[PDB]
Design an enzyme around this catalytic site. Structure first.
Site, short mmCIF file in Angstrom:
data_model
loop_
_atom_site.label_atom_id
_atom_site.label_comp_id
_atom_site.label_asym_id
_atom_site.label_seq_id
_atom_site.Cartn_x
_atom_site.Cartn_y
_atom_site.Cartn_z
N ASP A 430 0.92 -1.22 0.00
CA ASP A 430 0.00 0.00 0.00
C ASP A 430 0.94 1.24 0.00
OD1 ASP A 430 -2.29 1.63 1.50
OD2 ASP A 430 -0.63 1.80 2.75
N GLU A 483 0.43 -0.52 -4.96
CA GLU A 483 -0.39 0.70 -5.20
C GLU A 483 0.55 1.87 -5.08
OE1 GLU A 483 -1.80 2.81 -2.11
OE2 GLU A 483 -1.18 4.24 -3.68
MG LIG Z 1 -3.61 5.64 0.20
#
Ligand SMILES: [Mg+2]
Ligand SMILES: [Mg+2]
Ligand SMILES: [Mg+2]
Ligand SMILES: [Mg+2]
Length: 755
Positions: A430, A483
Site C-alpha cells: 500500500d 499501489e
Molecule cells: Mg492511500
C-alpha cells in the site's frame, strides 16, 4: 563420499548426518571455492541444486545409492540455495534440511547479517527451540548494538532477568541459551541503554505474541507444528505465469468479515482458546480464529468463484483501528485469530481448494509504541535518526532506515519469511509513494534532496528493487502487487529494465474514473464518456490490476449501491454494469468483501459485515451475479490470456457519448475464443443497436447483466443474434442487438451453429 558412509546414512547408523549432508567446503582456489551439497532423498529419482540469486541450477547425481545425491559446485560463496526434488512425476523446491548444523549464530551468519544479505536470518535471530551442550532449550538472539545490557525476562524466571543476562557477540547481537524451556514460553527482552534507562521490548523476530493489548513474545517451534499438503499447488504455481491466468481477488479484513459469540471459547485446529472480544463496546462479539475462517471463509470464496483471497495486514499490530497498517510484530501472524499453526492451516486449506493467498505487507513504516521497534537499543536503530526522512509526521509513525544493512535485512528476510514458512502466493504493498519520495507529505524547507538534488528516495528504491529481485528468484510464480499513486514509471516492470520489479500495479486512475462516472446521473454521463475510455490510453505502460478496494467504501464515500444514482432497481443495475465492465476490461480483478452482496452501509472495521441482508432476494441475486461472473471469467480465455498484449483488446466503437454506449473485442490464442462486449450505461433500452463484428455467423448471448436471475428486467437477444453482411464500425459484418438498460452483454460466435 564412500559407499560405507552412504550406507550409514541410508540405514541410520551414522552418528551425525550433518557431517556429510548439506553444504561442505571441499577446497579453496585462487578466486573461488569448491563445495559439495549432499542430500538423502528417499523416494526421489532426481534432484538439483538451485542457486536462485545467481540464476543457476546444477543437477545432483546419485552416488552409491539411487536416493543419495551429490552436487559439486564451484563458486566463491554458497550461502543461498534450494533443493529441487523429483519423486515420480512431481517436483518440490525446498530449503536444504541440513543447512544449519547449530542453533547458535555462526561467524558466517553474523557476517552476512552485517552486510545485509542474510536471507534466512530469522532462523537464528528471535527464539528457536534447540540443543546446545547436550541439553534441550531455547536459543534467543537480538540485534541491539548500543545497548549496555540485555536480559531475557519471562514466565520461566518470574520476569526477573538477573540470572539470564545475555552475551554480546561481535559488538552487535546479544544471545542466550536457556535450558529446559520450550515452545509456549512467554518472554520479552529487558534492555538497558547507554544512559542506564531500563525498559522492555517485544522480540522483533518473534514468531507469536500475546493478544493485544498484551505484548509478550511467545516461543514457537515453527517447523514442528504443522503438516502441509499443498505440494501440488506449489509446483503448479512455480511452473506457471500468473499474468496469463484468471486472477480475481476477494479482499478481506479478517477481524471484520464475520464475528462469533464471546460466550464460548475460540476453537483452534485440534484445541481452543479464550475468546478475543472485538471491543469493549461490543462485548458479546469475538473474532473468529484462523481455523474457523478456514472452515467458513474458504468455502464461501470457493463457491463465489474467486481465484485469490487478499488479506489486509495480518502481521501483529496493536490497534484494531489501524486495520493492520501499523505493525509492531513483523514476524508473527496476529494472535487475535489464534496461533501460527492455525494460519498455516488456513493457507494449506486455501491451496487444497485451488485458492491463492495474497498478504498486504507493510514495509513503509512502523508506529511508535514502546514495545515495538522504536528507538530500540537507545538509538535510532530501525528508524533513520533524521526526522525529515525517518518520520511520517502526518501519520505519527517512523520510517525504516532502508540504507542501513541490518534494517534492510530485517525487511528483506521478512518478506521471504511469509513465502517460506506460511506458503503465501503473493504480497501487496500500500502507498508505495510513501517510500519512494524524500518529500512525501513534507513542507518546503522540511526535507532534503538526495545526493543528486532530486526528490527520489534512493535507499528505498534500492530496497524495493532488492525485495522484488529476491522474491521472484526464490518463488517464481508469485504476485507482487503495488499501489503507487504518483505516476512513478515502470512500477510493474523488471528491475533490469529500470522497473521497481512488481508484476502488477493497481490502476487507481481507472478506479477513480469508474466510481466518478457511475456516481453521475445517467443523463449527464454523455459529458463524461472520456471516464469510460481514457484509462486504455496509458494501460500498456504497466501490468494493471483493476481494484475496487476497502479504501473506497469508508469515510463517507458510501458502499457501492449508495454511490449509484436512481431508484433501488437502477442502483443495483449500475453495480452490475460497472462490475461486468470491470471483469471484461483488460486487467486482473480485485474487489472487497461486502461488495458482492450489496451491503448498504460502509465497511466498519469494528463490527462484522451485514450478513442478514442475504435473507433477501435482491442481495441474493447480486451475489448470484458475482458467482456467475467469476465462473465466466475462469471459463473464457479471452478474459485473461492476453490482458497485457495489444492483441487482447480492441474498441469496436466508443463514440456514441450521447447514449453512453461503448463496445469492444477481447481475444485470446484461438480466434474462436474472441468476445464481443457491449455496454449500455443509461437506463434507456435500445431495441435495435448495430454493432460491427469481425466474422459471419451466429453470436451467442453468453452473458447479460440484465438477466432476471441477477435482478434485471430480462431484456436482451433471447439466446443470440445472427450477424448481417452489413458493414459497420469498419467491420464487414454486424449485429443488430437489443441493449438492455444499465447493462452489459458479452457475445461469442458459435462457429458450429446450424443456419
Ligand atoms: Mg492511500
Ligand atoms: Mg527486575
Ligand atoms: Mg472529467
Ligand atoms: Mg454484525
Amino acid at each position: 563420499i564412500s559407499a560405507d558412509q552412504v550406507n550409514q546414512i541410508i540405514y541410520n547408523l551414522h552418528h551425525d548426518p550433518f557431517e556429510i549432508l548439506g553444504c561442505h567446503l571441499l577446497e579453496e582456489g585462487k578466486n573461488t571455492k569448491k563445495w559439495v551439497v549432499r542430500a538423502y532423498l528417499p523416494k526421489a529419482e532426481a534432484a538439483w541444486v538451485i542457486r536462485p540469486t545467481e540464476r543457476k541450477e546444477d543437477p545432483m547425481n546419485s552416488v552409491h545409492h539411487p536416493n543419495f545425491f551429490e552436487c559439486i559446485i564451484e563458486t566463491p560463496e554458497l550461502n543461498h540455495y534450494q533443493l529441487k526434488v523429483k519423486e515420480g512425476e512431481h517436483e518440490k523446491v525446498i530449503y536444504d534440511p541440513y543447512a544449519f548444523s547449530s542453533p547458535y549464530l555462526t561467524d558466517e551468519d553474523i557476517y552476512l547479517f552485517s552486510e545485509g544479505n542474510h536471507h534466512r536470518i530469522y532462523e537464528k535471530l528471535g527464539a528457536h527451540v534447540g540443543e546446545i551442550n547436550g541439553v534441550k532449550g531455547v536459543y534467543f538472539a537480538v540485534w541491539a548494538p548500543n545497548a549496555r545490557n540485555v536480559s531475557v525476562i519471562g514466565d520461566f524466571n518470574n520476569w526477573d532477568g538477573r540470572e539470564h543476562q545475555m552475551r554480546k557477540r561481535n559488538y552487535t547481537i546479544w544471545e542466550l541459551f536457556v535450558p529446559e524451556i520450550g515452545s509456549g514460553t512467554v518472554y520479552k527482552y529487558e534492555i538497558k541503554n547507554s544512559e542506564g534507562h531500563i525498559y522492555e521490548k517485544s522480540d522483533p523476530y518473534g514468531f507469536y505474541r500475546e493478544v493485544r493489548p498484551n505484548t509478550a513474545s511467545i516461543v514457537v517451534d515453527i517447523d514442528n507444528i504443522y503438516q502441509w499438503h499443498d505440494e501440488e499447488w506449489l509446483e503448479k504455481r512455480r511452473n506457471s505465469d500468473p499474468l496469463k491466468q484468471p486472477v480475481s481477488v476477494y479482499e478481506v479484513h479478517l477481524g471484520s468479515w464475520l464475528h462469533g459469540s464471546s460466550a464460548e471459547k475460540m476453537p483452534l485446529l485440534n484445541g481452543e482458546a479464550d475468546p478475543v472480544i472485538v471491543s469493549e463496546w461490543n462485548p458479546g462479539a469475538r473474532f473468529l480464529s484462523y481455523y474457523e475462517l478456514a472452515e467458513k471463509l474458504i468455502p464461501y470464496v470457493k463457491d463465489m468463484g474467486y481465484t485469490h483471497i487478499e488479506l489486509l495486514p495480518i502481521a501483529e499490530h496493536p490497534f484494531d483501528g489501524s486495520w493492520g497498517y501499523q505493525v509492531t510484530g513483523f514476524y508473527s501472524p496476529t494472535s487475535r485469530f489464534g496461533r501460527p499453526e492455525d494460519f498455516m492451516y488456513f493457507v494449506d486449506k486455501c491451496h487444497e481448494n485451488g485458492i491463492g493467498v495474497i498478504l498486504d505487507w507493510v514495509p513503509g513504516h512502523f508506529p511508535k509504541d514502546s514495545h515495538g521497534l522504536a528507538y530500540f537499543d537507545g538509538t535510532h536503530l530501525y528508524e533513520h535518526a533524521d526526522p525529515r526522512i525517518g518520520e511520517h509526521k502526518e501519520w505519527g509513525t517512523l520510517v525504516f532506515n532502508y540504507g542501513r544493512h541490518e534494517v534492510r535485512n530485517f525487511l528483506v528476510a521478512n518478506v521471504l519469511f511469509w513465502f517460506d514458512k506460511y506458503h503465501v502466493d503473493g504480497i501487496r504493498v500500500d502507498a508505495v509513494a510513501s517510500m519512494l519520495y524524500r518529500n512525501y507529505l513534507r513542507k518546503e524547507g522540511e526535507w532534503i534532496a538526495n545526493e543528486y538534488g532530486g526528490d527520489e528516495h534512493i535507499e528505498a528504491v534500492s530496497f524495493i528493487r532488492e525485495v522484488n529481485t529476491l522474491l521472484f528468484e526464490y518463488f517464481p510464480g508469485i504476485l507482487s502487487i503495488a499501489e503507487e499513486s504518483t505516476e512513478w514509471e515502470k512500477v510493474s516492470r523488471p528491475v533490469y529494465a529500470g522497473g521497481l520489479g512488481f508484476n502488477l500495479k493497481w490502476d487507481m486512475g481507472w478506479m477513480h474514473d469508474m466510481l466518478d462516472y457511475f456516481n453521475i446521473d445517467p443523463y449527464f454521463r454523455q459529458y463524461h464518456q472520456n471516464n469510460v475510455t481514457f484509462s486504455m490510453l496509458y494501460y500498456y505502460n504497466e501490468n494493471f490490476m483493476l481494484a475496487l478496494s476497502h479504501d473506497e467504501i469508508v469515510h463517507g464515500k458510501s458502499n457501492m449501491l449508495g454511490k449509484m444514482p436512481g431508484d433501488e432497481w437502477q442502483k443495483y443495475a449500475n453495480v452490475r454494469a460497472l462490475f461486468t465492465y470491470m471483469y471484461t476490461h483488460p486487467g486482473k480483478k480485485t474487489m472487497f468483501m461486502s461488495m458482492e452482496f450489496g451491503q448498504w452501509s460502509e465497511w466498519n472495521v469494528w463490527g462484522d459485515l451485514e450478513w442478514h441482508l442475504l435473507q433477501y432476494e435482491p442481495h441474493q441475486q447480486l451475489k448470484q451475479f458475482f458467482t456467475d461472473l467469476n465462473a465466466l471469467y475462469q471459463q473464457e480465455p479471452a478474459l485473461y490470456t492476453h490482458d497485457f498484449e495489444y492483441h487482447g483488446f480492441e474498441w469496436i466503437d466508443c463514440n456514441d457519448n450521447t447514449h453512453s454506449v461503448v463496445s469492444f473485442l477481447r481475444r485470446s490464442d484461438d480466434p474462436n475464443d474472441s468476445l464481443v462486449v457491449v455496454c449500455n450505461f443509461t437506463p434507456q433500452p435500445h431495441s435495435h443497436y448495430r454493432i460491427g463484428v469481425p466474422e459471419a455467423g451466429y453470436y451467442v448471448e453468453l452473458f447479460n447483466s440484465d438477466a432476471k436471475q441477477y435482478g434485471g428486467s430480462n431484456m436482451g437477444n433471447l439466446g443470440g443474434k445472427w450477424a448481417d453482411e452489413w458493414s459497420f464500425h469498419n467491420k464487414p459484418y454486424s449485429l443488430d442487438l437489443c441493449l438492455p438498460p444499465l447493462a452489459v452483454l458479452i457475445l461469442k460466435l458459435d462457429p458450429t451453429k446450424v443456419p
